[PDB]
Amino acid sequence: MLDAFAKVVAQADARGEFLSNTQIDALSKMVKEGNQRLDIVNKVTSNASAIVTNSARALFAEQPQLIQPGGNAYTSRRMAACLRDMEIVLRYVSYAMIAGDSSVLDDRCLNGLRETYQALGTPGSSVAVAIQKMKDASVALANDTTGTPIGDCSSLVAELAGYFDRAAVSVV
Amino acid sequence: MLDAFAKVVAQADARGEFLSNTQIDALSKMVKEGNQRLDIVNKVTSNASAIVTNSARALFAEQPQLIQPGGNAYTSRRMAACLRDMEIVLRYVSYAMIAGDSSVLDDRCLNGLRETYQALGTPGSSVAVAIQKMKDASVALANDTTGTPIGDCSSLVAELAGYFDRAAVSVV
Amino acid sequence: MLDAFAKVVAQADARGEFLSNTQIDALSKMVKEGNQRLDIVNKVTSNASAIVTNSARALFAEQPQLIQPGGNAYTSRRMAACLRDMEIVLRYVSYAMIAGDSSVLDDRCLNGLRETYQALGTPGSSVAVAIQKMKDASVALANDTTGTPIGDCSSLVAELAGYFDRAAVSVV
Amino acid sequence: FRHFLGRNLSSLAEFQKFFAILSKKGLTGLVDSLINSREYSDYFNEETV
Amino acid sequence: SIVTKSIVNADAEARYLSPGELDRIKSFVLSGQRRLRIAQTLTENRERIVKQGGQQLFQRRPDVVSPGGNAYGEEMTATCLRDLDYYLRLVTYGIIAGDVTPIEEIGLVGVKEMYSALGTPISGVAEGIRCMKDVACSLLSGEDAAEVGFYFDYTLAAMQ
Amino acid sequence: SIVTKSIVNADAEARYLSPGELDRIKSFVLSGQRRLRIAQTLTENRERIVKQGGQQLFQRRPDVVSPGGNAYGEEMTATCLRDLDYYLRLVTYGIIAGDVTPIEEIGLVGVKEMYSALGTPISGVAEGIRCMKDVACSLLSGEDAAEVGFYFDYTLAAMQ
Amino acid sequence: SIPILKYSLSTQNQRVESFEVNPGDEQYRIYSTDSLPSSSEVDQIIWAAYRQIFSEHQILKSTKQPFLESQLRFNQISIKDFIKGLVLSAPFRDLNYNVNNNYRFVEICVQRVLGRDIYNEREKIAWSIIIATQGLEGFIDTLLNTQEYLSNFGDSIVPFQRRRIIPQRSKGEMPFNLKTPRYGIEFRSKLAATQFSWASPIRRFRPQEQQPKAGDPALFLNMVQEM
Amino acid sequence: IYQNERIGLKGIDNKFLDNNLSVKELIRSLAISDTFRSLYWTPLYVCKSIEWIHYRLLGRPTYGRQEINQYFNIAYKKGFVGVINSIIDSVEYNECF
Amino acid sequence: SGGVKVRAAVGNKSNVDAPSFKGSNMELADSGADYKAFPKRRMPGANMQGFLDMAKGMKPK
Amino acid sequence: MQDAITSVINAADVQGKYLDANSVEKLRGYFQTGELRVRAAATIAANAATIIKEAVAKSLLYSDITRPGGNMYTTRRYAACIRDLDYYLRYATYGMLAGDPSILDERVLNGLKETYNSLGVPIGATIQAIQAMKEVTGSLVGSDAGKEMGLYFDYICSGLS
Amino acid sequence: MQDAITSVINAADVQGKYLDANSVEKLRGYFQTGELRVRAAATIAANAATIIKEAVAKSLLYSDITRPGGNMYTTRRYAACIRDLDYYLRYATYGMLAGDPSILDERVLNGLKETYNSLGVPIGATIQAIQAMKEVTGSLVGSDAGKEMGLYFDYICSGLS
Numbered sequence A, B, C: 001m002l003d004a005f006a007k008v009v010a011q012a013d014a015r016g017e018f019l020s021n022t023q024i025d026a027l028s029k030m031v032k033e034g035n036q037r038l039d040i041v042n043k044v045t046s047n048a049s050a051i052v053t054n055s056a057r058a059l060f061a062e063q064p065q066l067i068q069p070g071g072n073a074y075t076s077r078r079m080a081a082c083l084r085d086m087e088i089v090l091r092y093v094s095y096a097m098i099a100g101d102s103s104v105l106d107d108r109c110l111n112g113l114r115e116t117y118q119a120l121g122t123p124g125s126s127v128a129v130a131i132q133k134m135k136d137a138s139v140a141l142a143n144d145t146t147g148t149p150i151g152d153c154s155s156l157v158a159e160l161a162g163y164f165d166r167a168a169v170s171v172v
Numbered sequence D: 001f002r003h004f005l006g007r008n009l010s011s012l013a014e015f016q017k018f019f020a021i022l023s024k025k026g027l028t029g030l031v032d033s034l035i036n037s038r039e040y041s042d043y044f045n046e047e048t049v
Numbered sequence E, F: 001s002i003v004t005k006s007i008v009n010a011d012a013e014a015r016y017l018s019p020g021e022l023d024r025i026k027s028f029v030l031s032g033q034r035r036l037r038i039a040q041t042l043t044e045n046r047e048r049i050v051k052q053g054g055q056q057l058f059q060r061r062p063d064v065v066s067p068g069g070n071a072y073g074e075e076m077t078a079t080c081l082r083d084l085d086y087y088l089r090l091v092t093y094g095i096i097a098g099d100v101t102p103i104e105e106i107g108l109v110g111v112k113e114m115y116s117a118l119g120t121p122i123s124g125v126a127e128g129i130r131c132m133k134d135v136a137c138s139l140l141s142g143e144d145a146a147e148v149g150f151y152f153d154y155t156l157a158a159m160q
Numbered sequence G: 001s002i003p004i005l006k007y008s009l010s011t012q013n014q015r016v017e018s019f020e021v022n023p024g025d026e027q028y029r030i031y032s033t034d035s036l037p038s039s040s041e042v043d044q045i046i047w048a049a050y051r052q053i054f055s056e057h058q059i060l061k062s063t064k065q066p067f068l069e070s071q072l073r074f075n076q077i078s079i080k081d082f083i084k085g086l087v088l089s090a091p092f093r094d095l096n097y098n099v100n101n102n103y104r105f106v107e108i109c110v111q112r113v114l115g116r117d118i119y120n121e122r123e124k125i126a127w128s129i130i131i132a133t134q135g136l137e138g139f140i141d142t143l144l145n146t147q148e149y150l151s152n153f154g155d156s157i158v159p160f161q162r163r164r165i166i167p168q169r170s171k172g173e174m175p176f177n178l179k180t181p182r183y184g185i186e187f188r189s190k191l192a193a194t195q196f197s198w199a200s201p202i203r204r205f206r207p208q209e210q211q212p213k214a215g216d217p218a219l220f221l222n223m224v225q226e227m
Numbered sequence H: 001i002y003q004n005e006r007i008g009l010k011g012i013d014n015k016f017l018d019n020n021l022s023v024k025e026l027i028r029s030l031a032i033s034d035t036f037r038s039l040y041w042t043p044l045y046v047c048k049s050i051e052w053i054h055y056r057l058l059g060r061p062t063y064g065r066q067e068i069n070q071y072f073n074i075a076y077k078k079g080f081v082g083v084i085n086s087i088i089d090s091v092e093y094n095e096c097f
Numbered sequence I: 001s002g003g004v005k006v007r008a009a010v011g012n013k014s015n016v017d018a019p020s021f022k023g024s025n026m027e028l029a030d031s032g033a034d035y036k037a038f039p040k041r042r043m044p045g046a047n048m049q050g051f052l053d054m055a056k057g058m059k060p061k
Numbered sequence J, K: 001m002q003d004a005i006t007s008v009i010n011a012a013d014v015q016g017k018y019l020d021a022n023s024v025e026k027l028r029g030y031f032q033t034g035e036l037r038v039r040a041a042a043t044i045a046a047n048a049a050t051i052i053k054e055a056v057a058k059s060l061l062y063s064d065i066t067r068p069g070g071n072m073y074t075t076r077r078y079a080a081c082i083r084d085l086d087y088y089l090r091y092a093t094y095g096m097l098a099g100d101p102s103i104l105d106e107r108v109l110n111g112l113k114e115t116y117n118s119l120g121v122p123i124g125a126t127i128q129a130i131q132a133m134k135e136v137t138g139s140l141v142g143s144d145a146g147k148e149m150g151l152y153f154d155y156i157c158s159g160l161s
């Protein structure tokens, strides 16, 4: 597991030189944005169980055959497993937002998630539909200017949007 | 594990359809042959160790190269394993005769069994004739009328035959 | 787990007969010089520590890039893991010299070692010459006639040289 | 000729007679001038492909 | 197109084009402004016309997508929608060419040999194009829906 | 390959192949088992051999990736690594053909005209192949690294 | 009386040592009952036992074991008797034992219980006759009395996947819940008539002429974004 | 020719450039190269190459069968270089050029 | 079953060695059979009975 | 002008992919027969004049193409034959080594049947000469090597037909 | 158009001699395999559509000749393939019964490679389709019968090359 600072340390550890004085200015620009980072995470971790169930409900109206009798997410054993499966993806996306780099997203979550949907028979294209349902709810809640000073945060919600459509192309 | 009743239900819940009235009567057909279904199994477990040792001796009246030095079933660990596997196969087909379909037979025993023996080096078709030495030691033992009165029950012993040759082609 | 005394007993009852006496004196060919065997292995076991430390330092004079930054053995965990592998391979050739055959060498050490070196990015060429650096330095350490009684035993120093390169053809 | 007669052209004048017909009436004028010849009828009249 | 087969018609007959042929090449090119608008509607609605096209196709033919159906699994269902994207593309060609000549020699000539040789139910793919037709004609007015639907049902006719 | 130009050599000279030519076609085909193993190593190491290949290339030539360099931005840098994947592929052909004949008529003949006409510094792409060579020879033993590196430096020679 | 089939080992990460004194970040969190937890910290052990022996799915209300949970909190049974109650639990039979055979169930009970991968495929052959002779309750206590269970878990540690990652690296191996799911490809494909008949919904429509061909620079844009 | 294959001919150019070589020897030095043999003798029919090669060296195509017989029979015995030498060392080359 | 002890066990290994000329008694593979379709040719016939009869003349010389 | 390795590299390159298991699978199949082809090309180089002398005497030596009026009457015309048959036995040797008949149609087959019709050379007698030449070539190099060298003779006979 | 018996009679007749022991020796060899060829031609007639469906799906089904721009894109062009592959599996069946590949070049091979170059049909993908079709044909008829039917497939692939 790395954070954003660890990928600059461990890169030049393989090159073996000291960290340059123009690279410290890139790390100090990150800690100036370090407190706008912490309320993108606090906005999405607090409405976490309503990002999930409002995105599942939007999925099951577009593709109604996933919940009809003989469908994949039909029973009450497997509706709960489908609802869990978006909670785990939203968990590791917010983990990779607070670290700054995606090295824990594709390690404990995406490392072979595609190959276990071929074994389970789960439609992997429909999990990537319901991740982009959750991307549209989470970047709208990271623009919420209540209890926070007004400023430009467009470069950090575009990084949160990057970890959502990385986990969508890794299941199809 | 599904019995004969659950295989009707699992096909009807997958389509989301109730059970019809003429479907109930075919399962009510099964329970008036209920004593005849049960006392077949009261033969084949009560003479069960006789069926093993009669067939295992008579296999080497047919293929004595297994007990040859260098052969597969030569040694006393391996002779104890050949009577082991014929005791297990006789055990699961008694479970399917009390069920009514072979779903406990090909989920426990026969699933992935050819690839065991080819990785073991055991001759595949040469254990299938040991199963067919147990069927005629049991379907003749089922037609014996000790203690029970007389009625036409050739339909049930065909299914008792029908498990022994479903199991015979799964090891070849 | 068999040895050279059990090597011919495996071929004995695979055929299936008693022990022919063309080999019973030829199994008394090395219980004469089994007294010559145990003081040959007393130089690779009781002087194991100079072998891995000298040859690794001479290896890096042959390849200067494997102690550079970007090299494979660069940090302190890797360089400790490198001698951990080199003291586990000449562990098992002292386990191979005590048994006559090489059945504990390939199984408990080398069974998959070519795969995991490709699965770690280690070059298989330079881990072969890590053992060739300790191949000639093990037999020339075995050829100290001082401290021991004297006489030519060039049979066993071809056997023990014949096990170091068996690892060196199993890792590339 | 390969299709409606089962043979190649024979001469040069057999070309110019049948090229001028196709030159003036196209496909419907050419194929009707082969099917209505005598050489068709001698080999195939009304029943033999 | 109407231009190329009105030519090859009069080409075979050893003659030029009649007023009946030249007052329609004339009538077609003045129609060309309205044709590109119609094809422009279907061009960037392929996301909704194909995906909703396969919507009704599976609801009406669950066999083809059920286990054992030809388009079963994540793989075949993607190709299951790929063909609909093909046939939706050819209808855009037929609308601009003013004829099913583009649809004729692409996706229609010998189509039964392909789908019979692929194991695909040819009646099933015909059901798919009909589902796309209701989505397509729902995107246009009545004057246009008599055209865009008009090319689909020709594809329905030749596909059975 | 060595087989095709040992033929066309003796072809032009109006003669058959000498023992010097036929004891090497013989010597090459017995070498064929070892060649496929070497090419098999580079085949599924292209992820590291290319990505680490462009690793040292940018550290040694930051101009080409800096703003104004030919491979600047997300776009050109992807194509910046695409060419290295090409030349790494041709080296796998040369190893199996036992000659740079595949590398000759692909990626070498007239290469200066292409890269001069693309605005790319041809010396820069030569630096890229050298960085791939150190990664490639680091993946093989000494007996193999005298071959896999041997085809790279020929590509280095012709690329300047 | 029929000892086990003498299989062979292989090369793995758990049978060497790490040289990791003061291990930094990827430690897999030894929950234990010798650290004397509070009643809110017994609850963080019982969730780790449910996540290890089941997956993260089957921690439902019906799959909880509320009488086995209370005997852990009274210190009546150990962790080793609590893992044995979870494999013999009736949710573990009908969800993870009725839907695969005996040669895949051994791959579950060595990946989750012992925390290591299987050595080779003969070990699945060598272990699967224990389940068919004396049963699943005879299979777990001969798997919990091995030396690999006692020498790094013992009587007080909920098990875990030992040495999943290499300490200088960041990728490592696959987690075992994402390695072996509830059922495999061989149980799913044979039942496509009664169960598992779903047919797949429609993918997002990609047009065919926008797909990259050999010699296109759009096949290297994922390489350039990793620079 | 491209710069990749012209490097093999650079020994021939500046040997001509310091006035150490005639034009005829320059022409024969180019035509007998492997750069030429790999382009017009190798990838062509054995009689079309003689026809094409005859058209570059001498400024005309062949007259009839006897002329094309004669050069072609040379390719039986000596081969590619033997045909080029038999044209540049011909009587018609030395008369016109 | 004849001798129940498996007939053989090929009385042991004395001087049992590989230099055993495999198929030393005796031959194999006949070549005159193969089957070429053409003869090996010859001249004379038709057009040439004149000169054969006439090379008898000098044959004996 | 491609050998078996050139053709394998071309098809694997023309799709822009590496040499996968199927491409190397055929390459290993070619390297296995590499020892057979050289010895086949060895003896054919030695007995080049003897093979052509055997073919013409066995196929078309005494037929009436050899007599006056036949297509092979004059000494220039007879000498052109053994010159002509030498190419078929020579280029077939090249195809046997390269393991690919691309060199034949590149340098022999194209414009060949169109040339014999110009000269009036009988294609029927030509193929039977090559067939007889194929028959003697199986004598020298053996059965399987004759199967290899014979596989390119009828390739010439097929296209020349 | 000659079978094994026709070719044996022709060579024995072309020298004006009777059917000696060598000519009948091959004829007896053909009659021994007469039972194998009919059963080979039996199952191939039954699974004609299944074999061609297996070959195209295994060799060139998803390659980019199948996609737009590839040589097999339009439905007329796709339908021409299975029509075209039917002849190769059919005429190879005739060669397997007749025991002589004379019918192939008589009715298939001549003007074939010269025709595909005109249309622009890829000869490379064609041979791999026939190779894959040869692979499935060895599945049905067995090993030796597949060796017989396979012996005429590569004859088509050789001449078509």
Ligand SMILES: C=CC1=C(C)[C@@H](Cc2[nH]c(/C=C3N=C(/C=C4\NC(=O)[C@H](C)[C@H]4CC)C(C)=C\3CCC(=O)O)c(CCC(=O)O)c2C)NC1=O
Pocket (backbone or CB within 6 Å): A034, A035, A036, A038, A039, A040, A042, A142, A143, A144, A145, A146, A148, A149, A150, A151, A152, A153
């Ligand atoms: C542990 C809890 C914890 C938090 C929740 C944050 C909360 C937080 N954010 C800011 C400070 C800020 N917070 C924002 C954030 C936003 N403005 C917007 O318009 C967006 C809606 C939103 C984030 C997406 C900005 C833009 C600033 C800096 C003000 C500026 O530079 O303009 C500050 C003041 C810091 C300072 O004065 O230096 C604090 C305490 N930090 C924490 O430690």
Ligand SMILES: C=CC1=C(C)[C@@H](Cc2[nH]c(/C=C3N=C(/C=C4\NC(=O)[C@H](C)[C@H]4CC)C(C)=C\3CCC(=O)O)c(CCC(=O)O)c2C)NC1=O
Pocket (backbone or CB within 6 Å): B035, B036, B038, B039, B040, B042, B142, B143, B144, B145, B146, B148, B149, B150, B151, B152, B153
């Ligand atoms: C513990 C297990 C167990 C059983 C096996 C049955 C035993 C049993 N079987 C029958 C009754 C019967 N049992 C049989 C069965 C047979 N008769 C034959 O001749 C065949 C040998 C054999 C079938 C293969 C038949 C046919 C009847 C009905 C008698 C009749 O037909 O009149 C009855 C009388 C009441 C009834 O019908 O149930 C009982 C108690 N009950 C049990 O609790």
Ligand SMILES: C=CC1=C(C)[C@@H](Cc2[nH]c(/C=C3N=C(/C=C4\NC(=O)[C@H](C)[C@H]4CC)C(C)=C\3CCC(=O)O)c(CCC(=O)O)c2C)NC1=O
Pocket (backbone or CB within 6 Å): C034, C035, C036, C037, C038, C039, C040, C041, C042, C142, C143, C144, C145, C148, C149, C150, C151, C152, C153, C156
């Ligand atoms: C209980 C543990 C135990 C040991 C460690 C050895 C130690 C040992 N070795 C030898 C004795 C010997 N040891 C060697 C062996 C060698 N000498 C050389 O010069 C070579 C370098 C080296 C080969 C490996 C030889 C050659 C003899 C002399 C006996 C002989 O072979 O004639 C003797 C004297 C008695 C004897 O001959 O056996 C003893 C005690 N023996 C044991 O019983």
Ligand SMILES: CCC1=C(C)/C(=C/C2=NC(=C\c3[nH]c(/C=C4\NC(=O)[C@H](C)[C@H]4CC)c(C)c3CCC(=O)O)/C(CCC(=O)O)=C2C)NC1=O
Pocket (backbone or CB within 6 Å): A066, A072, A073, A078, A079, A081, A082, A083, A084, A085, A086, A088, A108, A109, A110, A113, A116, A120, A122, A123, A126, A127, A130, G055, G056, G057, G058, G175, G177, G178, G181, G182
């Ligand atoms: C380590 C982190 C982690 C990952 C990445 C993970 C994936 C994962 N998803 C699973 C199941 C599942 N996933 C789904 C999800 C869906 N099916 C649908 O129809 C929808 C399209 C979609 C979501 C809405 C369903 C229904 C199952 C249950 C399988 C079953 O019981 O048949 C399973 C099997 C049981 C489970 O643990 O939930 C795994 C192992 N599990 C993990 O523990």
Ligand SMILES: CCC1=C(C)/C(=C/C2=NC(=C\c3[nH]c(/C=C4\NC(=O)[C@H](C)[C@H]4CC)c(C)c3CCC(=O)O)/C(CCC(=O)O)=C2C)NC1=O
Pocket (backbone or CB within 6 Å): B066, B072, B073, B078, B079, B081, B082, B083, B085, B086, B088, B108, B109, B110, B113, B116, B120, B122, B123, B126, B127, B130, G004, G005, G102, G125, G126, G128, G129, G130, G131, G132
């Ligand atoms: C799911 C139910 C189930 C089945 C069916 C099963 C089969 C099974 N049979 C086995 C071995 C065996 N099976 C046989 C049996 C035979 N060999 C012969 O030559 C005869 C044909 C035949 C006896 C009549 C023998 C000899 C072995 C021992 C192989 C060995 O130990 O090397 C083994 C290897 C472990 C062992 O017993 O040593 C398994 C896993 N295991 C199961 O759990």
Ligand SMILES: CCC1=C(C)/C(=C/C2=NC(=C\c3[nH]c(/C=C4\NC(=O)[C@H](C)[C@H]4CC)c(C)c3CCC(=O)O)/C(CCC(=O)O)=C2C)NC1=O
Pocket (backbone or CB within 6 Å): E064, E065, E069, E070, E071, E072, E076, E077, E079, E080, E081, E083, E084, E086, E087, E106, E107, E108, E118, E120, E121, E124, E125, E128, K057, K061, K062, K063, K066, K067, K073, K074, K075, K078
């Ligand atoms: C432009 C005219 C045109 C068409 C139509 C066309 C079709 C076409 N459909 C194919 C496959 C396929 N097509 C389907 C289609 C279906 N499955 C169903 O259940 C449905 C009924 C149906 C779609 C609505 C499936 C499942 C495959 C894959 C079959 C296999 O993998 O064996 C393939 C082979 C793979 C490929 O190259 O794409 C072609 C060429 N090509 C063309 O050039």
Ligand SMILES: CCC1=C(C)/C(=C/C2=NC(=C\c3[nH]c(/C=C4\NC(=O)[C@H](C)[C@H]4CC)c(C)c3CCC(=O)O)/C(CCC(=O)O)=C2C)NC1=O
Pocket (backbone or CB within 6 Å): F064, F065, F069, F070, F071, F072, F076, F077, F079, F080, F081, F083, F084, F086, F087, F106, F107, F108, F118, F120, F121, F124, F125, F128, G215, G216, G217
């Ligand atoms: C198999 C032999 C072979 C090669 C080598 C090849 C190269 C090649 N390189 C190209 C572009 C390019 N190549 C580069 C390359 C570089 N920029 C740098 O700074 C570096 C010095 C260098 C790479 C290491 C760039 C930036 C472009 C895009 C130029 C542009 O967009 O104007 C293009 C045009 C786009 C394309 O079709 O890919 C071709 C054809 N083609 C071939 O067939």
Ligand SMILES: CCC1=C(C)/C(=C/C2=NC(=C\c3[nH]c(/C=C4\NC(=O)[C@H](C)[C@H]4CC)c(C)c3CCC(=O)O)/C(CCC(=O)O)=C2C)NC1=O
Pocket (backbone or CB within 6 Å): C056, C066, C072, C073, C077, C078, C079, C081, C082, C083, C085, C086, C088, C108, C109, C110, C113, C116, C120, C122, C123, C126, C127, C130, G010, G011, G012, G013, G015, G016, G017, G018, G166, G167, G168
């Ligand atoms: C069954 C007995 C057994 C075997 C056979 C075994 C092999 C083994 N060698 C390993 C690593 C290794 N092996 C080497 C060795 C070398 N790399 C070099 O560059 C040098 C050329 C060479 C030694 C001089 C290194 C450096 C690592 C660690 C890789 C790393 O952590 O970066 C690892 C990875 C885990 C670890 O860090 O220890 C295993 C599992 N382990 C075992 O327990």
Ligand SMILES: CCC1=C(C)/C(=C/C2=NC(=C\c3[nH]c(/C=C4\NC(=O)[C@H](C)[C@H]4CC)c(C)c3CCC(=O)O)/C(CCC(=O)O)=C2C)NC1=O
Pocket (backbone or CB within 6 Å): H045, H046, H047, H068, H069, H070, H072, H073, J065, J071, J072, J076, J077, J078, J080, J081, J082, J084, J085, J087, J107, J108, J109, J112, J115, J119, J121, J122, J123, J125, J126, J129
């Ligand atoms: C390398 C590929 C290749 C071939 C094959 C080739 C053939 C070729 N054969 C020729 C003539 C000839 N070829 C023959 C051959 C024959 N007469 C017979 O009856 C037989 C059937 C046959 C011998 C097998 C004869 C007699 C001539 C002379 C024709 C004449 O003087 O009119 C000529 C005219 C010029 C010359 O021989 O100098 C050419 C160019 N050229 C090529 O580049």
Ligand SMILES: CCC1=C(C)/C(=C/C2=NC(=C\c3[nH]c(/C=C4\NC(=O)[C@H](C)[C@H]4CC)c(C)c3CCC(=O)O)/C(CCC(=O)O)=C2C)NC1=O
Pocket (backbone or CB within 6 Å): K065, K071, K072, K076, K077, K078, K080, K081, K082, K084, K085, K087, K107, K108, K109, K112, K115, K119, K121, K122, K123, K125, K126, K129
């Ligand atoms: C009995 C001997 C014999 C053969 C073999 C034969 C072939 C033949 N193949 C043809 C076309 C064709 N052949 C193909 C075949 C292919 N496309 C591919 O990508 C594949 C590599 C290949 C399938 C294996 C296609 C696509 C056409 C149509 C070409 C066009 O419309 O331009 C045509 C043009 C006319 C027509 O099909 O109606 C002929 C005459 N004729 C014969 O008499």
